Design a binder for this molecule. Sequence first.
Ligand code: GTP
Length: 588
Amino acid sequence: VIREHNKWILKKIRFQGNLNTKKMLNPGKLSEQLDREGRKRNIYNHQIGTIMSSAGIRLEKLPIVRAQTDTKTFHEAIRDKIDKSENRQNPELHNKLLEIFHTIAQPTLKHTYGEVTWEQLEAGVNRKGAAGFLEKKNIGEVLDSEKHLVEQLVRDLKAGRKIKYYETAIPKNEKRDVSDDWQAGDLVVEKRPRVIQYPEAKTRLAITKVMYNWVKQQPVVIPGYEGKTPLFNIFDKVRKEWDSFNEPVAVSFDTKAWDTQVTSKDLQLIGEIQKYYYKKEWHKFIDTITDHMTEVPVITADGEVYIRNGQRGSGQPDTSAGNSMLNVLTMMYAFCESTGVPYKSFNRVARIHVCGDDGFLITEKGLGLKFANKGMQILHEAGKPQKITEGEKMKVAYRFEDIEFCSHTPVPVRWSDNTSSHMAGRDTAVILSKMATRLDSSGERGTTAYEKAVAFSFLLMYSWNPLVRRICLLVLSQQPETDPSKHATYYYKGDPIGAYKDVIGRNLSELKRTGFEKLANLNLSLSTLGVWTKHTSKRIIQDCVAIGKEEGNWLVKPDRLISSKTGHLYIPDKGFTLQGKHYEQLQL
Ligand SMILES: Nc1nc2c(ncn2[C@@H]2O[C@H](COP(=O)(O)OP(=O)(O)OP(=O)(O)O)[C@@H](O)[C@H]2O)c(=O)[nH]1
């Protein structure tokens, strides 16, 4: 019981309290917070957050917390992962790994790679790209002015000269999924930070500029490199391979802290593979740069300095390519050595998919489990320790939907024309989490021109999720005469629904059904964690109907269920899908 002149505060609570105070009342949390600089910004996306709160969705219950950027733990991070000797690896590992590479190399491109125009390096670049402990300017600023300094770096490197190489190590500030944790007792309030180790935004532009093709894997030369592959159509092509086996089994790759496991010889092996695709003139640039990465001096954000014995530095330009190639080769290596299947014969009995250290392969039940069992040991001595599990063997999948990749598994979808396909699935709880806390930082206070680009982006990815799909449609119904933001993953031109068709291949309205028992599972956590109420679904459905009832062409009617209830369809006008300020150019 609180005093009257104090109840006014209550008009502002928007979430249950988390203080867990025991002798002092803790009414609730407010919708806003305080900037690291004192300002008062929002926690979630307004439009989206509001719609979700309409139904019994409790934003405060979404498995999402921030990472601890404090130095105390930031150091505990370095000490717990990066502080390690290099993994002992069997002798011929790198010879036999190189051997496997040659069985997959394309002679057509051998020694054909060269430098690139500032005009393509500049394409899609994240300008606000870090600076480096001893560097004043960031990417963009370097691009604006010191563009010349970068050209001599390239020269000094091509000539294999002196270069004071070093990396800055800072804890990555970001919100992290804690779904698993909360699903079990551990109600963590925040999670350990990832240490980003990176070159100096000059040395970055220098390396990237000449090695654009390998790094940006334009001609994709890495077996099963799913890196430039949009996520919303990968399982369809993977379903193909699955269906091409008699008793298919999928085995996932689970290296514990990949980056932390790359050896010097691993880095050298990629150096070689790199020299295979680059013209002889650049081979010294590669040797010089590779030589430095074998032992890097690292300056932490607070001043400390450690001499890392070259593992991988997340901020290095060659992380995606390097890690991927190195991953496939090592997995291919392990597989063959476990089954006996000749290196050269891999593609005869197996199909592989890799994205960094993330990936899996598909083979017959026989070979597959022989690999999962003998792979633990073989990989371990190869220097890529697999996460220890109760099963004692690599994670095997006997069902297609049980295939996990890039934090997603295949969700079955039934189209109106009685055909099927699979989309990228994930626990709803998490989709909703990321959809509510993704705030774009084109710094801006965010529009409704950004929340639309986000909803559109989540539409392409999760149309198979009714709840999520409808939330998007509602957001997209707002302010029709205001184009979407380009600061989201994808954005659209013309009609959103028209655009959906553009990349998905089918129209939203043609989406007739979602695997019952798959969707069912992906919604289980929503209750365990009490994220929604037994009326949310109903409510969101009503929210939609309301809008699409009256005669007119409403973009909320592309949802079959809503359509049948309002009796109206939605006739799309053309639309086109596009990326925004990009990471790795997806080839849509
Ligand atoms: N196939 C595919 N995978 C992608 C794509 N974009 C990101 N991924 C992967 O998907 C995983 C999950 O990413 P998300 O949680 O959606 O996005 P995020 O930006 O990495 O995460 P937060 O910003 O912290 O919310 C990532 O770890 C990447 O491996 C894409 O276009 N295609």
